[PDB]
């Protein structure tokens, strides 16, 4: 993270000497490293809690801006204050200082403070207001509304399905059946190896292990040429559930109905075969044997 080094005094009449410049959009990066000095020697603020006191223009009161400094060494008079979202809030030429107090029961005993230093906050693209849809906006405002749409949208949809489902299954003695069967059937079409059938011919006299994977927009299979697809090098890869059946030099791979794809059969030099239909690719990896032929079953 970014650090700003300052050697602040309590005796030397500086008033304005020492600038700290940072931006509005700087979450947890901007840090103030200060050395506290009194009469040329470091002052020990042991038993006193440090505070970042900010005198913001356009936002004054009794507690203009004050926050406890967490990282500090009172033995040597050093502190590290990380700029909080409240300190970044006030864009413009501001004044700040560090205070050290000994508070007990509401009322304070002792409180000594350092000289004032300039705390200048520069605008960000997030702070600057912009014109969108005929109205003037700030980022935080628009980001809040969009995240409300995304979260209330999800909640409204999960309630839509829940309420709709309960019309069919909860209000009917035989309607529960229709709902349940339709869901089971779909799972069996995607997770159970029953629908799709494929034959792999090999050179081995034994039972070679076959692993099947399905993926879209693979290398050099995208519609508009190389690197034209949304996910470069292949999208999501699905490990296809398989039911293996063996005969002499023939492996029968049963797969779910959803993985049914009739395309071009490409045989690679080793124990690897692909079925490519435009963007959709079905991969067959065979161990301890060499694929000679591959074809679907009717």
């Amino acid at each position: 993270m970014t650090e700003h080094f300052i050697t602040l005094s309590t005796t030397e009449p500086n008033n304005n000497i020492g600038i700290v410049k940072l931006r509005h959009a700087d979450v947890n990066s901007q840090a103030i490293v200060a050395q506290i000095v009194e009469n040329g020697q470091p002052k020990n603020f042991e038993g006193l809690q440090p505070f970042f006191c900010l005198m913001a223009q356009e936002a004054t009161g009794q507690g203009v801006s004050e926050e406890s400094v967490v990282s500090f060494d009172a033995k040597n008079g050093t502190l590290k204050y990380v700029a909080s979202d409240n300190a970044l809030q006030f864009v413009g030429r501001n004044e700040a200082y560090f205070s050290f107090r000994k508070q007990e029961g509401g009322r304070w005993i002792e409180q000594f403070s350092t000289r004032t230093f300039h705390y200048i906050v520069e605008k960000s693209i997030y702070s600057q207001p912009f014109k969108d849809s005929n109205y003037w906006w700030t980022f935080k405002e628009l980001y809040r509304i969009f995240n409300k749409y995304i979260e209330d949208g999800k909640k409204s949809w999960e309630q839509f399905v829940e309420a709709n489902r309960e019309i069919l299954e909860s209000i009917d003695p035989g309607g529960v059946l229709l709902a349940k069967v339709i869901d089971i059937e779909k799972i069996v079409n995607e997770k159970v190896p029953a629908g799709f059938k494929f034959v792999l011919e090999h050179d081995s006299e034994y039972q070679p292990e076959v692993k099947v994977t399905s993926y879209k927009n693979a290398i050099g299979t995208e519609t508009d040429g190389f690197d034209s697809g949304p996910v470069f090098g292949g999208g999501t890869i699905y490990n296809v559930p398989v039911s293996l059946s063996y005969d002499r030099q023939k492996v029968y791979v049963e797969m779910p109905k959803s993985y049914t794809l009739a395309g071009d059969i490409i045989l690679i030099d080793d124990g690897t075969l692909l079925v490519i239909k435009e963007t959709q690719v079905l991969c067959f990896k065979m161990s301890d044997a060499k694929i000679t032929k591959g074809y679907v079953f009717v």
Binding site: K102, G105, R107, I109, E110
Partner: protein, 162 residues
Amino acid sequence: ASIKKVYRGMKNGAETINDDLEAINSELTSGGNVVHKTGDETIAGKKTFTGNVEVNGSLTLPTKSWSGELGGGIILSLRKKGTTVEYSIGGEISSSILANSNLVNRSVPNEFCPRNRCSLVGHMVGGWNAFHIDIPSSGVCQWFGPTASSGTPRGTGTYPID
């Protein structure tokens, strides 16, 4: 001493004052960062005593010992104590040592080497024979006596280092 602050409208005021006075008075008898008239304590820093100092017990100073055969069979035993090194000549002359010659068998360490050239007066067992060995700033001792082949070297004393 670790003391608590006293202020107006303080809860347990009389208790705080008493605890602060007791903490202070405790350091007046034992412990803390103060030298006492009684007890074993460690003192740090450059202390200047303008008055007269009297020691009834034992005075301990940094001690370092060294012994080695300088040359020809002459063994010198050295013991450093502050700014004064105590020498002890011993052994037996085996080989012939020339007059005003250098002893090259063993050299005196730099921590025992004096600023000025010191002479160590010794006596030979047997007759009325006397000898002296010079220690330079380098540490390479010299036999300032006449040419001798046999004899017993003896002599104990002190020599300055600064």
